[PDB]
């Protein structure tokens, strides 16, 4: 999977302490202004995802449904 | 592919696209080996944490595709899958260890200038070929950057892209990340002051990482685009499933009518 920066505190599997994924069983504590991020231990909720794209031309009707 | 370049037509006959059947969106890449088989990276299909488990019923394969978005009526071929094999021991609750899976075409597709199967290494052209410094190849229609920065260089290519990468040495792969590294994965990228650069990215996933042979003249599928600790991140590199190290489980699922 590609791992990226944690946008909310509590978040689980994200790029928390530098470019280092904060694995499961860990919580990314978003440092406030000029304070450092701290992937502390605790259960925490993973980031969102299951993406990529927005304008896919119409494919032959039945394939899809 | 982060800082690659638009691919020529036929540059990658074996580059398939895993298409979530509706929602309209590109889920990943895969390679095409038989003419009725497909090879992708597990997590594209089953990734428990992202509420990911998919069905034959939820995704379409497209082969000999260039445009990311355009439907290419005369060129590409959409195939409905039949089976979905995942690796008996695919470890998402860690490192994405042996993150491989075989798909199966609900028919044998017919090859074209746009469709060709890719090779699976042999102790000859794997042992001779997996020497760090050696440039591999990656193709994909994923992002040209990482957008959780509000991404300029609007990260989606409109055509398939390609970057060639050197193979990096084990020792240096482990020093990159905190994650445990297995045998079942090799990394590949530029040392951090090589000038040249490039990396795979979001949606490039479970896509080809091939190497051509000088000895015979084939394109070989060394690894699968497994995971990233930020695409084209500095002093960071990209992990690839090791195919050779699994060439063997693959075997046992093709036959299987066999044994």
């Amino acid at each position: 999977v590609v791992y990226t920066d944690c946008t909310e505190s509590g978040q689980n599997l994200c790029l928390c302490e530098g470019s280092n994924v904060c694995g499961q069983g860990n919580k990314c504590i978003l440092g406030s202004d000029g304070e450092k991020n701290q992937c502390v231990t605790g259960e925490g909720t993973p980031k969102p995802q299951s993406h990529n794209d927005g304008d896919f031309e119409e494919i032959p009707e039945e394939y899809l449904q | 592919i982060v800082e690659g370049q638009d691919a020529e037509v036929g540059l990658s006959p074996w580059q398939v696209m895993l298409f979530r059947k509706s929602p309209q969106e590109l889920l990943c890449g895969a390679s095409l080996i038989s003419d009725r088989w497909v090879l992708t990276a597990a997590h594209c299909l089953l990734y428990p944490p992202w509420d990911k488990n998919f069905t034959v019923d939820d995704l379409l394969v497209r082969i000999g595709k260039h445009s990311r978005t355009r439907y290419e009526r005369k060129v590409e071929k959409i195939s409905m899958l039949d089976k979905i094999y995942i690796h008996p021991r695919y470890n998402w609750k860690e490192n994405l260890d042996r993150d491989i899976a075989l798909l199966k075409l609900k028919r044998p597709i017919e090859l074209s200038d746009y469709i060709h199967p890719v090779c699976l290494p042999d102790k000859q052209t794997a042992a001779k070929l997996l020497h760090a410094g050696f440039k591999g190849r990656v193709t994909g229609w994923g992002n040209r950057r990482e957008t959780w920065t509000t991404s300029v260089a609007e990260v989606q290519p409109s055509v398939l892209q390609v970057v060639n990468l050197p193979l990096v040495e084990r020792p240096v792969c482990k020093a990159s990340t905190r994650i445990r590294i297995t045998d079942n994965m090799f990394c590949a990228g530029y040392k951090p002051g090589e000038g040249k650069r490039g990396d795979a990215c979001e949606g490039d996933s479970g896509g080809p990482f091939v190497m051509k042979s000088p000895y015979n003249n084939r394109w070989y599928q060394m690894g699968i685009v497994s995971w990233g600790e930020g695409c084209d991140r500095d002093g960071k590199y990209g992990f690839y499933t090791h195919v050779f190290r699994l060439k063997k489980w693959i075997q046992k699922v093709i036959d299987r009518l066999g044994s």
Binding site: - | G10, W37, K104, H116, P117, L120, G133, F134, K135, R218
Partner: protein, 36 residues
């Protein structure tokens, strides 16, 4: 025994097949010949 291990594996109908090389392809064999 669906195969997957075809005999005409990774021979590009346009590139190799036609005798024609690919754009960046030298790059890869420039890797192997400066060595490791």
């Amino acid at each position: 025994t669906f195969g997957a291990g075809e005999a005409d594996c990774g021979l590009r109908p346009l590139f190799e097949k036609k005798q024609v090389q690919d754009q960046t392809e030298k790059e890869l064999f420039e890797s192997y010949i400066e060595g490791r």
